[PDB]
Symmetry: D2
Subunit: 31 residues, 4 copies
């Protein structure tokens, strides 16, 4: 289940980008 989040901001998208990569890292630490 994917969700498309269209944004017209490089700064905003940058945040969600760093937050998304950081969340994925936590998963690797668990398993």
């Amino acid at each position: 289940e994917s969700f498309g989040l269209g944004i017209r901001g490089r700064e905003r998208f940058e945040m969600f980008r760093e937050l998304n990569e950081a969340l994925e890292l936590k998963d690797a630490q668990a398993g």
Copy 2:
């Protein structure tokens, strides 16, 4: 310009979703 973030997380996407809507409101206040 214009960046689409395809997140497969209801929780994570929920955060960026609320952050995107809240960020758009600030832009309206400016000007």
Copy 3:
């Protein structure tokens, strides 16, 4: 309800600081 956080990051804290302010604005609009 009021918790405190000890962050020594001007940029990081600045981000969460903007969210808190923008969050309070959403309550005024309600919707």
Copy 4:
């Protein structure tokens, strides 16, 4: 100088809290 955050939301602080803790982990990795 340190910057305290006074949020009136357990959920909100959780986000900013998980971000600060998750962002600090990245430093340990470095590149």
